[PDB]
Paper text:
We find that Anbu forms a dodecameric open-ring assembly that locally resembles the architecture of the self-compartmentalizing proteasome, but is not closed for steric reasons. The individual subunits are essentially all in the same conformation, assuming the same fold as the proteasomal β subunit. Moreover, a comparison of the active sites shows the catalytic threonine and most other catalytically important residues in essentially the same conformation between Anbu, proteasomal β, and HslV, which suggests the same proteolytic mechanism for all three proteins. Via an extended C-terminal α-helical segment, Anbu forms a dimeric antiparallel coiled-coil interaction across this subunit interface, yielding a 3-fold increased interface area for this dimer compared with the respective subunits in the proteasome.
For experimental characterization, we recombinantly expressed the Anbu-1 protein from the pathogenic bacterium Pseudomonas aeruginosa (Pa-Anbu) in Escherichia coli. Unexpectedly, these 34 subunits in the asymmetric unit constitute the repeating unit of a continuous helix spanning the crystal. This is contrasted by a high degree of variability in the lateral interface between the dimers, enabling the formation of the irregular helix with its two unequal turns that differ in the number of subunits and in the rise per turn: A superposition of all possible pairs of neighboring subunits yields RMSD values of up to 1.6 Å. We initially tried to fit the profile with modeled closed rings of six and seven Anbu dimers with different diameters, but could only obtain reasonable fits when using helical segments of six dimers from the Pa-Anbu crystal structure, clearly indicating that the solution structure is not a closed ring. However, the Pa-Anbu S1 pockets superimpose exceptionally well with those in the proteasome, revealing a relatively narrow, amphiphilic S1 pocket, in which F30 and L52 form a hydrophobic patch, whereas the moderately hydrophilic T20, T48, and S55 are oriented for hydrogen bonding to various positions in P1.
Numbering used by the authors:
A (entry chain G), B (entry chain H), C (entry chain I), D (entry chain J), E (entry chain K), F (entry chain L), ...: 1 to 241
Write the structure that this text describes.
Amino acid sequence: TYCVAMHLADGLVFASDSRTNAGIDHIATFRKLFTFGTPGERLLVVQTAGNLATSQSVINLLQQRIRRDGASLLNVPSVYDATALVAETTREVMARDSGNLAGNTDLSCSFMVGGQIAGGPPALYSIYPQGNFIQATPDTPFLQLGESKYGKPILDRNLTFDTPLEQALRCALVSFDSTIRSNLSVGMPLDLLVYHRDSLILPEGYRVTEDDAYFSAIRRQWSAGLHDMLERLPSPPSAYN
Amino acid sequence: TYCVAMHLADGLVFASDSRTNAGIDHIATFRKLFTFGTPGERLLVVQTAGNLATSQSVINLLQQRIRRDGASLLNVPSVYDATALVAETTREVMARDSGNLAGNTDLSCSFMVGGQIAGGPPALYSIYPQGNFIQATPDTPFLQLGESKYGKPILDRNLTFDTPLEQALRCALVSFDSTIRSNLSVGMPLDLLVYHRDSLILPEGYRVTEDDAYFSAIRRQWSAGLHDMLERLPSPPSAYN
Amino acid sequence: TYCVAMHLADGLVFASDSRTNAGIDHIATFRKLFTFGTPGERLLVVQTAGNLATSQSVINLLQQRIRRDGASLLNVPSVYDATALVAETTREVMARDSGNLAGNTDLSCSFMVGGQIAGGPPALYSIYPQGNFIQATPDTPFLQLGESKYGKPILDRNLTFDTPLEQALRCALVSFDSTIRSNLSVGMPLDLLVYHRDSLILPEGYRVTEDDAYFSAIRRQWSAGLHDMLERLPSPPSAYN
Amino acid sequence: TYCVAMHLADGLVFASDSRTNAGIDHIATFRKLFTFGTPGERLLVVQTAGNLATSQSVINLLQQRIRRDGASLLNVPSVYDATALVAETTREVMARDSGNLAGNTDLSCSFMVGGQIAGGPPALYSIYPQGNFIQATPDTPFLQLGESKYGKPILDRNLTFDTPLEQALRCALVSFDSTIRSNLSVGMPLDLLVYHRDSLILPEGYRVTEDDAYFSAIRRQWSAGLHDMLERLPSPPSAYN
Amino acid sequence: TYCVAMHLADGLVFASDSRTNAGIDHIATFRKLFTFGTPGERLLVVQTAGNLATSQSVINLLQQRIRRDGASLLNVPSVYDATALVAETTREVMARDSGNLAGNTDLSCSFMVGGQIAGGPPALYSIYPQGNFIQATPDTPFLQLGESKYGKPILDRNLTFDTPLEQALRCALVSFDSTIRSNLSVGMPLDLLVYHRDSLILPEGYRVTEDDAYFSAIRRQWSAGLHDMLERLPSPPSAYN
Amino acid sequence: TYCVAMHLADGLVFASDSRTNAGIDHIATFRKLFTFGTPGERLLVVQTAGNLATSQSVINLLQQRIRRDGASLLNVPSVYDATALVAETTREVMARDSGNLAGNTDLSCSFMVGGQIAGGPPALYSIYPQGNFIQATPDTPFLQLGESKYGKPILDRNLTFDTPLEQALRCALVSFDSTIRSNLSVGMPLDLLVYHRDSLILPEGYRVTEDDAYFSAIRRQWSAGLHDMLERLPSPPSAYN
Amino acid sequence: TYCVAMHLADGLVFASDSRTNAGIDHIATFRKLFTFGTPGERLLVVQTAGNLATSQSVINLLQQRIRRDGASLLNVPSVYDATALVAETTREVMARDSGNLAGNTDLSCSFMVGGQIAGGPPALYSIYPQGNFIQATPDTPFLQLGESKYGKPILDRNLTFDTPLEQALRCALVSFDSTIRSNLSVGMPLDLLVYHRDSLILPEGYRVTEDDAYFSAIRRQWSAGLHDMLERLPSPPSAYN
Amino acid sequence: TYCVAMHLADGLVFASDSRTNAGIDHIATFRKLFTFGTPGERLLVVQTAGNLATSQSVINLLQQRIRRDGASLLNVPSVYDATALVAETTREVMARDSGNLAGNTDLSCSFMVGGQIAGGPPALYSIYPQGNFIQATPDTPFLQLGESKYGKPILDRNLTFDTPLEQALRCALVSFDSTIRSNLSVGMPLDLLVYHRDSLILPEGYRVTEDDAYFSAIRRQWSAGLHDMLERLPSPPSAYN
């Protein structure tokens, strides 16, 4: 479980893995990036991390309620209020499943909610386990969920609000490369989605499998590159021994 | 707090940061790499991570006991037994400080113990919070303590049992570069030590400050390198949008 | 005790064994697949694993309550809510039988709940011992209960959301074949049920006995096949000795 | 962690994975198959599963003690007594590391010990977590450690005391194939060793990596085979719906 | 103490011995089969096994409470709920007699509860020492309490859901014959009751004494039969010596 | 696990199953009947039941010690002393494997030891979990180990000191028939041995597999016989309803 | 200490000795049969055996509490509940006197509680040292406390539910005769009470002393009778020598 | 288990039952009266009670040692010394079987040793569980083992040193009658032996089975007699109600 989202000058980029702890000796693939919207009016993306049961219930309720007269991700007036609604829904799920039977088992999960509603700029929020949230800004234009330390440095180094979408996406992919190599809890397939500021369309998004030609290639290249740079770095002076 | 140690064909390489959480609003510099030994007979290095009070007490008792007739890091017959002694000492410290007054505060810490005693190969162990330990091997030739996910990938990618010492050290430094950029809890100065297999001398080791010419240079180079490789990676195919 | 359920493009497939630990020196046959519904409106299937007393009580209450004005598997508005109801009922049963008299004996059990209610797609959930549940998806389209590691690989290898029902069923049967050979706790007769997406009928389902001509045949074939493939695999090179 | 050993008419075959849980967020490669002996006099193989710290300590002490006047794997008069010595050593390690500091953490591990000493037949034992052990026989000629249910069926189906070594090894590899696909805690490289009855030599053994041409090939073949056989199985009769 | 109960297509059959361990050097006769009901409305039978004191208290309270406005075996809406009530009552009794004074003495007992209440089919449950219970089904149509292994085989071999009552009873009697011969803790008189599906009458039931003409006769016949069959079985081939 | 041994006027008969609990989810085949002796001088048979590890170790030590100058099953002056030696050996094995590591796991096992040594009559003993033993006599001429209640009645009914060997063996086989049908922990193959009083030869003994023509036949006959006798028994009189 | 009670068709009969171990070298007379009740409403009898201090304290508290608003032997709704109250009281007494000071001394005692309360049949219970109790029934119509084996046979032989009260009493007296002759811990005076079913009066009861004309007479007669019968029995045949 | 022995003016009489607790759910027949001697020189009888394993071992060793140059029941100079030897042998057996493996299980047993050695009068001893013994005398001419309270009164009443043998034997038989009726742990067949003072022959002794004409007859008579005497006893006076 590792998710990244970026809010940049030209729009939004989202990327999630799929490897999921679904119980003991049951590790499995589950989509962690979900889209919602009405074409020409709004796009909203939700990413998930943490307890599967909880996050599934949250997503499921959001879907059921879309087709119902009352508060829903389709009628909510701002990305902020969408984020609040997701949190609100999370609280509701935690209230029901909590009891003596759950015991000490850890039901918490976290989310990212981003997108654009007609008449206001695109936005991106992250909701924490405890249900309070923060918003990405130009100074801090990307947010992560899950097992994210491994792939943070490459984003810190290169990403900024002005990074174009194609490059941000590339950058995200390198993030996943390192993460996947160093931590088995994170794993393919990946799910990506790029959204263009003011387009107000629902992009189809794209899934990166084990076989993906492009992703295989940039991984091979990135390895060769790092190995090269390392050998061509200078030796430490006398002093260091 | 981030420490790395490597046990390679040609010897051992150790590196630690110094930034330490010593209470609220009191972040400070403390050495996390300590050496012990008698020239021509043995070298032992201990690195620390976790609770400052605990680790300090452990190190302090190991030093006091060196100058005393009984079990000590200078008479212990093997690196294994040295590791065991450190652990033994840790248990002793935890027993004394534990009480109602400590309450729920977290007194645990972890260590690495590596080196060489005359008449057997060099070795490297890591002691866990709970006092049990593991040994580095050719298949898993480096071990980390502290805040280590950020700088793990570069080691996973490039380091192997056969990597020479000068290159392993270099590799470690890049590990610290990324870590420092992405996590404030980790910070300079760094303390390094390189030990040559069968030398049985106590290297002086070296401290890398903010001002270090060499470290500044390889950071600047590494940045330029990464930035280059990133721009010269190919674009995603049509399919990805 | 081994149960499998699959949620595929064309519908649902369920399969359970019947061998049951009913106490010490009392191993016995009990159905572990139960159906509910009203023709033209809904089909729901519940499978059971774990403590017999507990699961029986749960099923029994669900049956009694069907014929009663209030929450029941026949009036519940979605497969989700059905799953929730089963869980709710489980909690109720655990509460009552728990006491000093039970002592340390393990009263937990698990369930699968799947089916289709008029006006929404078919769905499949698995409820864990602790009462929280997950939903099968296209990326993870089958779920297991009980003693399931033995027969997992064949499903992992061949089954996907798009697998047709007849082939999924066949696949399940091979899963049971391996399981039965390698673990005595699992045993015949088996109980199967196939449901076609949007049919909204209650299939009669089918019981596979010791004598079943078809199942005997595919077991014999599958053996011969495996034995053949193994002999016709190449020899390991020189290197391997 | 998955290990298999077979004691057959023509000798012994051993195979182990290397993926090891070494702490939280620290999964790593460690050899789990170790050899000992004097050429023309004896071969002994020890495989490990369970807690890394414990098993490492046991192996380490056995190695140190080989080079010492007293009970050791090189002077022990029978494979039985070797097994007993390993167990004896395990007890010793558990006694020392046990204390308040370990707490509720699970230090147990299991071993296989097999081989041949001059003047008696080859033998194979498995030591349980609790320190008691069993011997493989003609009726039960293979033994497993670790995560073994996934790959048990293929061994149950095909393996017997009279299976030749080359075919037993092949069989083991298919066992690992299924296991690796269905459980991420098991992983390459693998380590194999084949020993010929009465040879009294120390085979070098062989390591199967990710890249291995032969293993890659039989995996590809085995997949194609299974897929074929599945499509060419008959359809269930009318009765089954 | 040995009890059997069967739930068959045509109704229920119950049979119990009477020999009871009432303390040290005090073995005695106590009825272990009790009936309750209102003619034309319900029949319930309770059988007992285990601690005399505990089971007596349970039965005694059930009787007292029948003549009292509140939950009782006469008003309870289903055989299920009757079983639950018995269990509920058992818990109550165990709570009271438990203390330091009882010490380690074993107060547990088990029950069978079967019968029919107007408007639903007949049913049969068995309650375990720990208070949870199971229901007999067509696949497992008989249940035993007490010292039951001796007489199990004849029931396993011959009894099924479709066995008529007169034959099931006969079968039960042969079960008791073997048991009584092979285990002194079981002993006559026996108590039988046969109930016809949908009759809703309280059969008087019947006691089999030492002197019973019919039971004496079938025992004599059964012996002669077994002895005959044994002598007329063929001799083992050469091979067997 | 079910073993029987008989000491009759004409000699000894031994029979054991092979199904063995070797751990959780690991049920397997292991021989439970072992022979020892020198032709023309002695025959001794040992049967085992209970913990596999313990019984294997006992048997293994007895074998090793046979080929060694000191107390052994070949030099022991009487069947009594043989039994004592087996017990003695058992104590030795329990002493070693006992420790904190075993914990509460149950290491006990039981044995039968029977045979004949030149110059004295044949004899048969049974050793209990606690190491004390009894001897079979004319009044109690058979002894059982393991899961024996199921097949006791047929032996109680028919077997006496004067039963000839061929008929005793036949009787034993029927005992196994019933046991196997009613308890899964008991299972084929079976191992038999018949020894003729004063022959002083080592019979080869015989193994009964699943496929055995004779055993299959008498099982089929015995079923038919029982079914016949049951239908031809009279009906219970009026009185019984 | 020897007490008997019988529950017969026509009522109840109680009889107790009086010899009591009250400490070392202090054997003494204490009544062991106590009556309670309100004429025309209820009769309850309590007999005691075991530790004097304990039983006295129990009786004493029951008496004090009779004259107090709350649970007492006079308001309790059934003989069952009376028995439960006695047991309850016993627990209370054992709780208080238990401590380090008592040490290993044995404070346990047993009771019989029998009688009749208006509106339900007469009943008789026996409470065990541990506080659980049993009820006498038609099949087991008498119960004993204390040193009872000596006088059990005459009761087993002649007493049944239908035995009239005058004959039962006579039978009890012979029981005491044998007991007194064969065991010095039992001794006169005796205390009797006979109660007629449905009389609901408090009989005065009667004390049998050393001097009692009737008891002396039947003892003398019984001796003469036994001596006669013995001489007029036939001689053993030739065979017996 | 119930044994009696008498030492009278005219000789000795011994009688034992045979019912034996041989383990849980294994009650069986074993001889508890054993004879030894050389005609014209000595007769010794040993009776056993208590733990089967222990008493069997004792008897077995006494038999083996008879045929050996050293202390044995045939060379021992007095009945006293014979008794001492038995005790001595018991100690030896307890020493060997005692260990951690026996645990808390109760290995004790008791014996009677009686008979006559040329040149001194006949004698009779009883050995207690703790190995010290007593001798029967004219004032206390009979001794019992096992479950003996039931049949003590008839012996106390009628037996004296001067009772002739035929009458003492008869008396013993009545003792067994009552015991058997009132306690199931005691049971037939019985074993008797009568020895005539100064005869110095080994009587064959006699076994009383279920079918014995004489014993059946005196039981029937004794019942009728007791029943008669009881009905012919006078009624209690007015006073007693």
